[PDB]
């Protein structure tokens, strides 16, 4: 049992398959393990614009030796739960604020 938004070892294309479901509104997200970087995580979030329609953006979450996490070094967090809590309040760099936890 992990956090509701933690999807573990799912692939980048599987995260897109789940997030691109038309029933999921803009701002739907999940956190997963990175396929490209060992020890890093990815925040995958759905967005919408006039050119692309519903699309997915992926953000790399790096873990520090001190135990912290960040997407941009200017804003660091002590846990993944603090990171999700912050980005649920302000977009601050992301395409959209986190609003809906990806189902199933």
Swiss-Prot record:
Subcellular location: Cell membrane; Mitochondrion inner membrane; Endosome membrane; Nucleus
PTM section of the record: The phosphorylated form is termed pp60c-src. S-nitrosylation is important for activation of its kinase activity.
Membrane-traversing stretches: none
Annotated signal peptide: none
Superkingdom in the source lineage: Eukaryota
Tissue specificity note: Expressed to high levels, and with a high degree of kinase activity, in certain fully differentiated cells such as neurons, platelets and macrophages. Isoform 1 is widely expressed. Isoform 2 is expressed only in the muscle.
Occurrences of domain SH2 (ranges): 5-102
Assembly and interaction partners: Forms a complex with polyoma virus middle T antigen. Interacts with AFAP-110. Interacts with GJA1 and PXN.
Summary of the function given for this chain in its UniProt record: Non-receptor protein tyrosine kinase which is activated following engagement of many different classes of cellular receptors including immune response receptors, integrins and other adhesion receptors, receptor protein tyrosine kinases, G protein-coupled receptors as well as cytokine receptors. Participates in signaling pathways that control a diverse spectrum of biological activities including gene transcription, immune response, cell adhesion, cell cycle progression, apoptosis, migration, and transformation.
Protein family: Belongs to the protein kinase superfamily. Tyr protein kinase family. SRC subfamily.
Name the UniProt record assigns to this protein: Proto-oncogene tyrosine-protein kinase Src
